[PDB]
Design a protein around this ligand. Structure first.
Ligand SMILES: CCCCCCCCCCCCCC(=O)O
Ligand SMILES: CCCCCCCCCCCCCC(=O)O
Ligand SMILES: NCCCCCCCCCCCC(=O)O
Lengths: 178, 252, 60, 289, 252, 60
């Protein structure tokens, strides 16, 4: 999917898939592939330190007749990624009800031993993970597609800042006339 | 619109775009025990956020012929994070709850669920001159199932929906706090229950303060509606939990 | 005819300022404005006419 | 304020975390409509119970001035003290910040920029390799000359043109501090333009892009001692530190590598790195698997 | 007399009829984290009594040739009631402690113990170019033992008392908060330690905030004193415990 | 906008002071605080609750 519009689509569907986790990823805004080339990520890469809360907006793109509730969870570090909805709901989470408001915001509050984390994150400055689960499956009437996509947007909250300027790993050259 | 609604307890938040209202106990919001109502003399523990938050129980499937389901309450949350741990370590406990039952379908589906909290739902035995089991009463999360016919078996609850396991007319369960989930208009039910008992505090393993019952009155139905899977999910959040009489943990 | 302004605060929670005099005839010769810190995210995060109160639906 | 002044107070504090408790209402801050093109303004306190935190963190180092205002190499070239080629006796290029990527990607984050520039030159010389290596060359003195578009161009290290009666020049001798000077905002327009989705000719042809807008002249640099018994060669490095900056209409950071200096050309490149599955989260916290 | 003394935290009380004084950190009493010193933004849990009380660890025997003993700290209380449970469920924690070391003998016995709390007691390896084990560092309750000679073995701490496992002069451990238990005058030691670290809060499994060391400097001795059994017992009580970043429990 | 303070006294029992001006925008650039001489042995030599008057027994 590295060069196709799919990399941006989170697949979700009608029928019984509760045991099936929808997605999950580490919270390393400047380092993990999921975030590094994001607007927030590209910026973090020109610095060595970051701090702040992050907003993850999820937008449902199925038909208007589609329905459903999801559980969006964020787990601070210290344990491995929740492996079931039971485990995930013990952490920070919102239960999102698909409706006229197509989007839902999971805000990742800043919880850390230190005031700052390395953009080049290590285990010492771990930030945890966010995982998503069907809270109550996707139901749909006849004549409508039984599977759709959910998109995810990221952005910094107003308590966010960065420090210690450095060059980006992302750009380079072998010779002049660049 | 007033269909829209959000609720936040601890590190958890619930949302709905299709709510009815919110039912509150017998009009009473949960409160912590007052000094002029207390007997246990030791300082209470009030974990607050670590304990008063949304725990989601394992979901159930609504089938075209489901009779119903139930859960006993302080027990059922006994393995839920710190709420459960505080249960194991203390002799006495007290809490209120926000119960949020979720069930979405489609404008082309139909059905109607009664969602009730019955305080002190003492149940009858299948074997008329026998006695129940704790197992016949509750299975923690999961959920016991009502039945469409008379049941037999020693220890199990006489569970024909029609008499709600209590020997009354199921259709009269409405004197208890409740909401209905009518698929054509509504996709969730929210009930806030205050602590109700004849003593200020009590042991949370030995006494089921109340039972949550979800009974379909008009059955699930649909057509080529490539959605036959319609789950129901229960999320509950203890409110104002306080504990007394700390000692070693209870034997599982 | 000099200017005194404060230093960026360092290693601790009057001697925290510096003095400067410009010796050249062109503004281009001056040092950088590293101390100006304004901000207006709005131009970009919220360029919608019709104020979105967001605590309210946003549609309806 | 005035973005030309070397002083100006005020701390750039981020927001405090407002203390938040339990809620049961119709408020639904966590539910928005991304279609409007508006970015949600939700903070932790809108979705979880938060304590109050007096936050002292400042955004000082991410101000446009502090982000761009660091000298960056934008060019390097060589020239010899002695050679048969005449051409190889002096260096020359056309001013632009498009030949070294680091600086270029930084500027290209903005569509338009306006600023003064502090230019610093680092010049070094080495003695060329050969069979006979003994000589006693006095200190080398160089001449850097700027030729605005339209000025006569040097054709040899000894051209009359190096008289600089009017072009500005810098004479510098090795061993001393690197030469340096400020240049004002020199554009013909109201802001330097980093991108130009346009042409040079009115008939929608000619040259496309950045180049048609450039034309800031060129630099020529030569040795002044002019000689050395044995061959030597110098390298001139030029650094740009923009200062007194203003920037407009930000754009995404360049994702694909640059292919050349005159174009925005690129090869298709990956959106990001792959991972195993959409649920893959590595297991740290194990007695080491 | 001022030898007499009582202390109460939660549902527990300690008494002594032969105390010296009470040493307090570096003069600092424990306090809860202030808003202008915090970074973690979520609401903390402050279990209070359920958590801030006296836990007694398994005792040790003082023998005529015991070199000494040590315990690492937040870890060591990890299985102590709700203090431990709150550790497992949270990413961040913070606490102070009242440490009470008990050792009584008789007017005919003699000996002298140094009781110290060393903040950040990073220890060295026996195998000079190797690295330690978590096991070589701590065994929870119980207690690691110092040694009278140089030790070998990969992973174990170079524990010859003389260098306190840190590469210094044991007799200089007094710049750290401490008391002495000189049997002829005293039968217990009490030290109140405030939270000390370079960050406002921290993870309680990954970082040993401080080490408690009990090192006999003058050895136990006696005569036909039909009492050869002289135990030492450590009781500690977390103070102002607060936790942040709640999620599922950590993997044992 | 300068500061005048006194010099550390040397070889003898008004001209015993110096003047300083800060030329940089960051406190980190300033010179060391070699003239601050506070002290509080107590944290370490006497961290006992219950004040020990010592001219009195200390036990009893
Ligand atoms: C064009 C070169 C001008 C040289 C300016 C040097 C200023 C020296 C500091 C003099 C004392 C400050 C007077 C006031 O203002
Ligand atoms: C950022 C470089 C600033 C250069 C500051 C030099 C100050 C020169 C002493 C001027 C006379 C003192 C004025 C008073 O105050
Ligand atoms: N002897 C130095 C001559 C310097 C002229 C420099 C003009 C630099 C202009 C910076 C242009 C960057 C841009 O196109 O965005």
């Amino acid at each position: 999917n590295l060069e196709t519009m799919d990399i941006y689509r989170i697949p979700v569907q009608s029928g019984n898939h509760q045991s099936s986790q929808v997605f999950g990823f580490q919270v390393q805004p400047g380092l993990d592939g999921v975030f590094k080339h994001t607007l927030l990520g590209e910026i973090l890469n020109y610095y060595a330190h970051w701090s702040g809360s992050i907003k993850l907006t999820f937008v449902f793109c199925g038909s208007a007749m589609a329905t459903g509730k999801f559980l969006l969870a964020y787990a601070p570090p210290g344990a491995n990624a929740p492996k079931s909805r039971k485990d995930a709901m013990l952490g920070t989470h919102i239960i999102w009800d698909v409706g006229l408001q197509s989007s839902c915001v999971l805000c990742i509050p800043w919880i850390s031993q230190t005031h700052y984390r390395l953009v080049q994150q290590d285990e010492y400055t771990s930030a945890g993970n966010v995982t998503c689960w069907y809270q109550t499956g996707i139901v749909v009437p006849a004549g409508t597609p039984t599977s759709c996509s959910i998109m995810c947007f990221v952005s910094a909250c107003n308590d966010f800042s960065v420090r210690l300027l450095k060059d980006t790993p992302f750009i380079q050259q072998a010779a002049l006339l660049q | 619109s007033d269909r829209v609604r959000s609720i936040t307890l601890g590190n958890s938040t619930i949302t709905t775009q299709e709510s009815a209202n919110v039912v509150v106990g017998y009009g009473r919001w949960p409160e912590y025990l007052r000094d002029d109502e207390a007997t246990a003399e030791d300082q209470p523990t009030q974990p607050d956020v670590a304990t008063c938050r949304f725990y989601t129980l394992e979901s159930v499937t609504w089938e075209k012929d489901s009779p119903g389901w139930w859960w006993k309450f302080p027990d059922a949350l006994k393995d839920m994070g710190l709420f459960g741990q505080n249960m194991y370590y203390h002799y006495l406990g007290r809490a209120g709850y926000t119960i949020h039952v979720q069930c979405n379908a489609s404008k082309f589906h139909q059905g109607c669920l009664l969602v009730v909290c019955v305080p002190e739902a003492e149940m009858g035995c299948s074997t008329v001159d026998g006695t129940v089991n704790e197992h016949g009463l509750s299975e923690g999360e999961t959920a016991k199932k009502f039945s469409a016919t008379g049941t037999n078996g020693t220890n199990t609850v006489q569970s024909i929906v029609t008499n709600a396991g209590m020997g009354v007319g199921v259709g009269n369960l409405t004197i208890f706090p409740h909401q209905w989930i009518n698929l054509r208009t509504n996709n969730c039910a929210t009930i806030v229950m205050p602590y109700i008992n004849n003593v200020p505090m009590d042991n949370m393993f030995r006494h089921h303060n109340f039972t949550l019952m979800i009974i379909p009155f008009v059955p699930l139905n649909y057509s080529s509606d490539f959605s036959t899977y319609v789950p129901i999910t229960v999320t509950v959040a203890p409110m104002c939990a306080e504990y007394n009489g700390l000692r070693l943990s209870t034997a599982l | 005819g000099a200017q005194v302004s404060t230093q960026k605060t360092g290693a601790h929670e009057s001697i925290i300022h510096y003095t400067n005099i410009n010796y050249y005839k062109d503004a281009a010769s001056n040092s950088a404005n590293r101390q100006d810190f304004t901000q207006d995210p709005g131009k970009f995060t919220e360029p919608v006419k019709d104020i979105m109160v967001k605590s309210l639906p946003a549609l309806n | 304020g005035d973005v030309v002044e070397a002083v100006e107070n005020a701390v750039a504090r981020v927001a405090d975390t407002i203390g938040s408790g339990p809620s049961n209402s119709q408020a639904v801050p966590a539910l928005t409509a991304v279609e409007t093109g508006h970015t949600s303004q939700v903070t932790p306190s809108d979705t979880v119970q938060t304590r109050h935190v007096k936050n002292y963190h400042s955004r000082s180092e991410s101000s446009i001035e502090n982000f761009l205002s660091r000298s960056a190499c934008v060019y390097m070239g060589e020239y010899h003290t002695t050679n048969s080629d005449q051409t190889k006796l002096f260096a020359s290029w056309t001013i632009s910040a498009r030949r070294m990527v680091q600086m270029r990607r930084k500027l290209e984050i903005f569509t338009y920029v306006r600023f003064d520039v502090e230019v610093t030159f680092v010049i070094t010389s080495k003695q060329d390799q050969g069979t006979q290596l003994g000589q006693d060359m006095p200190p080398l003195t160089h001449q850097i000359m700027y030729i605005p578009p339209g000025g006569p161009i040097p054709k040899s290290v000894t051209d009359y043109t190096w008289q600089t009666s009017t072009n500005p020049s810098i004479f510098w001798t090795e061993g001393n501090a690197p030469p340096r000077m400020s240049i004002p905002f020199i554009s013909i327009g109201n802001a330097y333009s980093n991108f130009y989705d346009g042409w040079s000719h009115f008939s929608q042809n000619g040259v496309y892009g950045y180049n048609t807008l450039n034309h800031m002249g060129q630099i020529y640099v030569r040795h002044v001692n002019g000689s050395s018994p044995l061959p030597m060669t110098s390298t001139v490095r030029m650094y740009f530190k923009p200062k007194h900056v203003k920037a407009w209409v930000p754009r995404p950071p360049r994702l694909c590598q640059y292919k050349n200096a005159s174009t925005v050309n690129f090869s298709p490149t990956d959106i990001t790195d792959k991972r195993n599955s959409i649920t893959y989260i590595p297991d740290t916290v194990k007695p080491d698997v």
